[PDB]
């Protein structure tokens, strides 16, 4: 390693030490509220006076902020300098700052958060040390003026290099450049970890999910031609969806549904992955809105399957889970609406599941077939199994009526199935 | 069989014939020992420059290779040779016709396992002796005790204990006393690989059906299990750079990396070595480095490095994928035609049935490059059957001509 | 502040700190001379005299 | 006598003490805001330095851990997380087109003769 | 002391 | 009847689906502010269909 | 601009290794 | 067997595709910019080959 490179690491280790007046001017001039000329003239007491008041306003809106008055916004924090602390003390200091940035993530639209975070910028130099956490918590605010001020005073980490053109520029970053940042595989792992912390803390909010969903969905689209890169995208984003489904929040579950559906069409998957997907979808369905979004997702995924077993019956455990979260009446309503999406493959597989495991529900099979038109080969599969039902199960009015339904519609095909089977 | 004009010197174009390579360190220099037929070669890991080649060819092919500082142990037929800088110092001859299979050296003990499930133990004559020479005892594993011997391993901080690993299960022998101290519970799947972990008392076992088992010997029970369905493990190795990483090589030619801390796959290197030639025969992290050396039966040796994370925080999460660092290779099949490239005798051209033309260095650098078949405008070509080269106009225009099998024209190459 | 600099080529190296301790002057025996501010990691000069 | 409570408050201000703050930072919890074998030969064997083998074992084991620090992956030893498991099983997620009777939409497998 | 102990491919065997 | 007839019947049964292209969701950023999540998923389904 | 990934030159470093002589 | 597809080429290079199962084309292929001289489906009807001389 050259001497310059070894000196580059030294320069980064003590970037915030303020060895001379010129260094102090740069560190102190950074601000989120004021311009550089005014900021250099300010002292910590004036900055802390505004931040402490701003924290009180945030405490009223969210009581959780009041805890930071004890540690990060204390009067003794004015005298606390990170450069004279040890390893252990800094880790504790870093943990408190990261926690604050999570709380402040959803309140950046409020003016007080900008004053409260000024103290952390001026006192603790978060824009130099906690630079990734700050950028991550404010990605969805990329169009707001506050995000623009952040880019000016901050040194972009290696993974945020796409944003360099918008540092100290008139125009804000475009949505197209957001996709390029998320397109990077390394950045996806970084954002996955940050999103994971939010889910554990229940710190997620709708604007974060909306922005996160769009970036993930657009990232699939840009890679539609590249099948290999879609394959590498699987461990990351489908793992994210599993975590979002695990969350109790309905908004989190809906985002997982949206991520799953756009992927399923973009890349065809093994039926095992699709079946595993629905078991995760169905495990944590309590919200009504999530329940609506789930059914459309489940119908869509089965539509993507195009190999043998496309319309085979669901597994026993899988079928029992589905009917519990979706009654037969609920499915009948789903088929009832004229604007119903294409779900023939699922209904065909659902119909065959009923014949295998539920005998009382055969009468519902007759209603389901009338509501939805199934494809020619799907109709053949249902007839083929119902023939086995007659041989094994006792003859029933609903069973013969199901046959009579097939007698009325496309009589000739009924003979062929009987001819091949008996 | 001996000439009065000629004597063999070394082999050019072989890095490894498929026998697992052995690694070691001399002070600050890491070295890699690779078997090439009836002789072995020692490379410098930092540069992949050839350091030593065995002085003579063994009467038979080498089955095992173990490297311990300045001494390289090579097993062939019923004999184990002890070599220093490629020069044979001491030859150990076993008393049974059974051929040696595996080899383990720890402290003053040398352990050799034969194909007949017999383990021969040798000891140093003197505690300051450089290599073991004396015959200590013989330990034989019977079918009731265990299956065929898979590999001989030694765990750290085990006094005179040899961890014999068989297809059926693991066995622990005290070589000093020659007694079966511990017998492991039977495993459902056939064990194929064994690797001592950098932790105390755990040994990683690889099975025939893509299962990796971090078995704890002291507690005698399973600790963790990684599933790799529809795969066969061929090599295992732990990272000693301070990251709890495990690299799993497969006979399909893939190399997977697991983060034991987070229970997740870091990355997979697909098709680094040919499946037809045994996939990844050997893969080892260098002790204390992010560099992993990989070998296969396709006559190729590669090194990959794990770069530092690009994230200032949570670097453990954001792991850079392994980056190809350097490699040495050659033909995958015997060369069909050869020619000396220059009057100085620095390079040779070579063509093989694998439809590739290669240039091999005749110096210690051991450099090797395949000439590009990318065509000028204005799958590999069929095997070369005749070749002619000149150097009167090298650097001016084409200076090589080749003939291809069942082809009605000849191609030209520029050296 | 406990700096370590790996210079394997032009050693051995003779040091000299400025009277106020703000600058470090290193001279390699093979002719590598560098002047820097060792706290802020700022290189003021670097000579590769082949001497 | 030990000084009074309102005395420390004065001393904290006058001397600019920050110990109380550092304790809160340490207490800051992010959640709140949001053998099968015995070898006889081991015991009766002793080595020069005499020390019995059993104590010699611990000396080596302590030495081993200094070279290699102990990691934490050894300390640990309709389902919600079904989807996480199926991703671990395979690193091939594209369905094999051999089974499919419908040719892929955008990629054509075509070879010249 | 007064003696370099260099372990290299070419020396330090002892 | 023959197996090839069943194969052709399966081929005929399959119906077209609107593929996902590069700039199929790019407009979603435009109307991402102050929108309910369920409505967002509905919009994603509408473009996908 | 893209994310710069410089293939930095990596050279090996000596490390401490457990000695198996003590095991005997 | 009855054919389920019907394609109509043109001098401009447009190929209207119709589903035989004032009809409206399911698609209007326009990748070729010259007169269509060949239209031909694969025997299973899963590929349409359109060419121009």
DSSP A173-207: PPHHHHHHHHHSHHHHHHHHHHHHHHHHHT---HH
Taking an 8 Å cut-off on Cβ atoms, the answer to whether A159 and B313 are in contact is: no
Q: How far is CA A342 from CA A338, B147, F16, in A?
A: 11, 58, 11
F8: nearest CA partner in chain D: D101
- The answer to whether residue A158 neighbours chain G at the CB level (below 8 Å) is yes
SS3 at position H4: coil
Cβ A92 vs Cβ D27: under 8 Å: no
**DSSP-assigned beta bridge partners for residue B233:** B250
Cβ B94 vs Cβ B53: under 8 Å: no
Burial class (CB in 10 A: 0-12, 13-18, 19+), A15: middle
SS3 at position B34: strand
G19: nearest CA partner in chain D: D64
- The answer to whether residue B87 neighbours chain E at the CB level (below 8 Å) is no
Cβ A244 vs Cβ A290: under 8 Å: no
What is the 8-class DSSP label of residue A258?
Answer: H
Q: How far is CA B259 from CA B2, B63, D74, D93, G17, in A?
A: 55, 33, 12, 21, 22
Cβ A365 vs Cβ A355: under 8 Å: yes
| B313, B319, B320: residue with CB nearest A132 | B313
- The answer to whether residue H46 neighbours chain D at the CB level (below 8 Å) is yes
Cβ B53 vs Cβ B10: under 8 Å: yes
| B182, B199, B268: residue with CB nearest D71 | B199
CA A345 to chain centre: 27
H neighbours by CB contacts (3+ pairs under 8 Å): D, F
Q: How far is CA D1 from CA A36, D4, D13, D15, in A?
A: 52, 9, 21, 20
User: Regarding beta strands B245-250 and B410-413, do their DSSP bridges make them parallel or antiparallel, or are they unpaired?
Assistant: unpaired
Dihedral, CA of residue A10, residue A16, residue A19 and residue A22, to nearest 10: 110
What is the 8-class DSSP label of residue A358?
Answer: -
**DSSP-assigned beta bridge partners for residue B282:** B295
What is chain F's length?
49
Q: For residue B237, is the peptide bond before it cis, meaning its omega torsion is within 30 degrees of 0?
A: no
| CA–CA distance, C39 with C8 (Å, rounded to integer) | 22
CB-based touch B/E (3+ pairs, under 8 A): yes
**DSSP-assigned beta bridge partners for residue H8:** H16
Q: Which of A62, A188, A189 shows the shortest CA–CA distance to A116? A: A62
- The answer to whether residue B127 neighbours chain E at the CB level (below 8 Å) is no
| CA–CA distance, A181 with A185 (Å, rounded to integer) | 9
Cβ H25 vs Cβ H16: under 8 Å: yes
Q: How far is CA A87 from CA A76, A123, B8, D24, F40, in A?
A: 20, 18, 62, 16, 45
Q: Which residues of D1-30 are buried (b: 16+ CB within 10 A; e: fewer)?
A: eeeeeeeeeeebeeeeebeebbebbeebee
- Helices A376-392 and A397-408, packing angle to 10 deg: 150
Q: Which of A278, A273, A271 shows the shortest CA–CA distance to A312? A: A271
The set of residues, in sequence order, having a beta carbon less than 8 Å from that of G19 and lying 6+ positions away, is none
**B52 chain-E contacts, CB cut-off 8 A:** 9
Taking an 8 Å cut-off on Cβ atoms, the answer to whether D105 and F14 are in contact is: no
| CA–CA distance, B359 with B340 (Å, rounded to integer) | 10
SS3 at position G21: coil
Cβ A255 vs Cβ A213: under 8 Å: yes
SS3 at position B15: coil
Burial class (CB in 10 A: 0-12, 13-18, 19+), B9: exposed
What is the 8-class DSSP label of residue D54?
Answer: H
| CA–CA distance, A136 with B127 (Å, rounded to integer) | 62
* Structural resolution in Å: 2.7
| CA–CA distance, H3 with H19 (Å, rounded to integer) | 9
Q: Give residues after which chain D gaps, C-N over 2.5 angstroms.
A: 34, 49, 77
User: Regarding beta strands B300-305 and B323-329, do their DSSP bridges make them parallel or antiparallel, or are they unpaired?
Assistant: antiparallel
Diameter over CA atoms, chain A: 96
Q: Which residues of B246-274 are buried (b: 16+ CB within 10 A; e: fewer)?
A: bbbbbbbbbbbbbbbeeebbbbbbeebbb
CA A213 to chain centre: 6
Q: Give the helix/strand (H/E) hosting D31.
A: helix D30-33
Structure-block tokens of residue F29: 């950023």
Side-chain half-sphere exposure of D111, counting CA atoms within 13 A:
2
What is the 8-class DSSP label of residue D103?
Answer: P
Taking an 8 Å cut-off on Cβ atoms, the answer to whether F11 and H26 are in contact is: no
| CA–CA distance, G2 with A158 (Å, rounded to integer) | 9
Residue located via tokens 């309590």: A286
| D32, D78, D91: residue with CB nearest A317 | D78
CA C16 to chain centre: 8
Side-chain half-sphere exposure of A213, counting CA atoms within 13 A:
33
Residue A129 has phi, psi (to 5 degrees) of -95, -60
Burial class (CB in 10 A: 0-12, 13-18, 19+), C15: exposed
Output the CA angle F34-F36-F41, nearest 5 degrees.
Answer: 125
Q: How far apart are the two ends of chain F, measured CA to CA in Å?
A: 36
Taking an 8 Å cut-off on Cβ atoms, the answer to whether D101 and F19 are in contact is: no
The set of residues, in sequence order, having a beta carbon less than 8 Å from that of A43 and lying 6+ positions away, is none
């Amino acid at each position: 390693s050259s001497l310059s490179d070894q000196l580059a690491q030294v320069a980064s280790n003590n970037a915030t030490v303020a060895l001379d007046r010129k260094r102090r001017q740069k560190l102190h001039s950074a601000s989120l509220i004021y311009n550089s000329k005014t900021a250099a003239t300010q002292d910590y007491d004036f900055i802390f006076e505004n931040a402490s008041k701003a924290l009180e306003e945030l405490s009223q809106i969210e009581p959780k902020f009041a805890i930071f008055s004890r540690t990060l916004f204390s009067e003794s924090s004015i005298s606390l300098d990170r450069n004279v602390q040890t390893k252990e003390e800094i880790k504790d200091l870093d943990n408190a700052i990261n926690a604050y940035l999570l709380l402040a993530s959803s309140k950046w639209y409020l003016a007080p958060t900008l004053h409260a975070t000024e103290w952390l910028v001026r006192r603790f130099q978060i824009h130099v040390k906690n630079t990734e956490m700050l950028l991550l918590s404010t990605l969805n605010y990329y169009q707001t003026p506050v995000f623009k001020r952040i880019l000016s005073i901050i040194k972009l980490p290696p993974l945020f290099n796409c944003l360099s053109n918008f540092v100290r520029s008139e125009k804000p970053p475009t949505a197209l450049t957001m996709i390029k940042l998320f397109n990077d595989m390394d950045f996806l792992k970084l954002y996955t970890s940050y999103l994971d912390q939010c889910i554990k803390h229940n710190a997620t909010y709708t604007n974060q999910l909306l922005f996160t969903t769009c970036c993930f969905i657009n990232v699939v689209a840009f890679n539609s031609n590249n099948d290999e890169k879609l394959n590498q995208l699987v461990p990351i984003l489908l793992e994210i969806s599993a975590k979002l489904l695990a969350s109790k929040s309905k908004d989190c579950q809906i985002a997982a549904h949206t991520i799953l559906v756009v992927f399923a069409t973009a890349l065809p998957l093994k039926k095992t992955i699709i079946l595993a997907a629905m078991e995760t979808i169905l495990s944590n369905l309590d919200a009504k809105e999530a329940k609506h979004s789930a059914l459309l997702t489940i119908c869509k995924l089965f539509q993507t399957l195009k190999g043998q077993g496309n319309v085979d019956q669901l597994p026993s455990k899988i079928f029992k889970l589905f009917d519990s979260k979706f009654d037969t009446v609920s499915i009948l309503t789903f088929l009832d609406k004229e604007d119903k999406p294409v779900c023939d493959k699922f209904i065909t597989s659902y119909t065959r599941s009923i014949a295998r495991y539920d005998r009382s529900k055969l009468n519902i099979i007759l209603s389901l077939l009338k509501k939805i038109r199934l494809e020619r080969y799907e109709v053949r599969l249902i007839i083929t199994d119902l023939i086995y039902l007659s041989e094994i199960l006792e003859d029933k009015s609903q069973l013969v009526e199901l046959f009579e339904y097939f007698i009325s519609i496309n009589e000739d095909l009924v003979l062929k199935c009987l001819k091949s089977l008996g | 069989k001996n000439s009065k004009i000629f004597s063999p010197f070394r082999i050019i174009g072989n890095v490894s014939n498929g026998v697992p390579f052995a690694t070691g360190t001399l002070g600050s220099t890491f070295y890699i020992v690779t078997c090439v037929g009836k002789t072995f070669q020692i490379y410098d890991a930092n540069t992949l420059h050839l350091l030593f080649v065995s002085e003579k060819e063994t009467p038979s092919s080498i089955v095992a290779l173990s490297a311990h500082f300045h001494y390289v142990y090579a097993a062939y037929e019923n004999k184990v040779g002890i070599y220093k800088r490629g020069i044979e110092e001491h030859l150990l001859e076993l008393e049974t016709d059974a051929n040696v299979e595996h080899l383990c050296i720890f402290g003053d003990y040398l352990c050799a396992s034969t194909d007949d499930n017999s383990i021969f133990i040798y000891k140093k004559s003197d505690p300051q002796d450089k290599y073991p020479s004396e015959f200590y005892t013989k330990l034989t594993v019977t079918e009731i005790q265990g299956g065929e011997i898979v590999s001989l391993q030694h765990l750290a901080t085990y006094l005179n204990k040899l961890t014999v690993v068989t297809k059926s299960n693991v066995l622990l022998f005290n070589v000093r006393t020659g007694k079966l101290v511990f017998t492991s519970n039977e495993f459902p799947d056939q064990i194929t690989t064994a690797e001592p972990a950098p932790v105390l008392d755990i040994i990683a076992l690889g099975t025939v059906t893509g299962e990796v088992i971090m078995f704890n010997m002291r507690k005698g029970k399973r600790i963790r299990t990684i599933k790799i369905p529809q795969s066969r493990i061929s090599s295992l190795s732990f990272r000693t750079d301070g990251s709890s990483h495990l690299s799993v090589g497969t006979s399909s030619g893939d190399l997977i990396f697991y983060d034991l801390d987070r229970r997740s796959r870091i990355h997979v290197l697909k098709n680094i070595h040919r499946e037809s030639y045994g996939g990844v025969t050997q893969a080892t992290f260098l002790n204390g480095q992010p560099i992993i050396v990989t070998s296969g039966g396709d006559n190729s040796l590669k090194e990959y490095v794990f770069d530092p994370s690009l994230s200032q925080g949570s670097g453990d999460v954001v792991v850079q994928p392994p980056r190809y660092l350097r490699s040495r290779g050659g033909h995958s099949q015997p060369p069909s035609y050869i020619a000396f490239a220059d009057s100085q005798s620095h390079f040779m051209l070579s063509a093989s049935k694998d439809r590739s033309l290669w240039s091999f260095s005749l110096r210690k650098d051991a450099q090797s490059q395949e000439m590009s078949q990318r065509l000028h405008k204005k799958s590999k070509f069929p095997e070369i059957v005749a070749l002619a080269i000149e150097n009167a106009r090298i650097g001016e225009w084409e200076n090589i001509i080749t003939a291809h099998k069942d082809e009605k024209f000849a191609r030209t190459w520029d050296m | 502040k406990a700096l370590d600099l790996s210079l394997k080529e032009f050693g051995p190296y003779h040091i000299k700190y400025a009277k106020n301790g703000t600058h470090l002057l290193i001279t390699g025996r093979k002719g590598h001379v560098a002047s820097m501010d060792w706290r802020k990691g700022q290189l003021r000069a670097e000579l590769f005299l082949n001497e | 006598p030990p000084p009074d409570e309102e005395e420390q408050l004065l001393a904290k201000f006058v001397f600019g003490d920050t110990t109380d703050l550092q304790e809160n930072l340490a207490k800051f919890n992010a959640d709140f805001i949001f053998a099968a074998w015995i070898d006889s030969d081991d015991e009766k064997i002793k080595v020069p330095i005499k020390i019995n083998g059993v104590h010699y074992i611990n000396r080596l084991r302590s030495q081993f851990e200094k070279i290699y620090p102990r990691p934490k992956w050894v300390d640990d030893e309709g389902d919600i997380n079904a989807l996480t498991k199926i991703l671990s099983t395979t690193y091939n997620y594209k369905d094999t087109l051999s089974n499919s009777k419908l040719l892929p939409p955008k990629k054509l497998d075509i070879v010249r003769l | 002391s007064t003696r370099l102990k260099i372990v290299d491919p070419y020396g330090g065997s002892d | 009847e023959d197996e090839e007839d069943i194969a052709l019947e399966f081929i005929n049964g399959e119906k077209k689906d609107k593929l996902v292209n590069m700039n199929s969701f790019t407009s979603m950023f435009d109307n991402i502010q102050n929108v309910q999540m369920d409505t967002f998923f509905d919009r994603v389904m509408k473009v996908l269909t | 601009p893209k994310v710069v990934r410089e293939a930095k030159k990596v050279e090996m470093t000596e490390a401490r290794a457990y000695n198996a002589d003590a095991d005997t | 067997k009855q054919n389920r597809w019907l394609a109509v080429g043109s001098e401009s290079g447009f190929v209207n595709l119709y589903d035989r199962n004032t009809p409206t084309p399911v698609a209007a292929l326009d990748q070729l910019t010259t007169t269509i001289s060949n239209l031909q489906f694969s025997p299973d009807g899963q590929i349409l080959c359109m060419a121009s001389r």
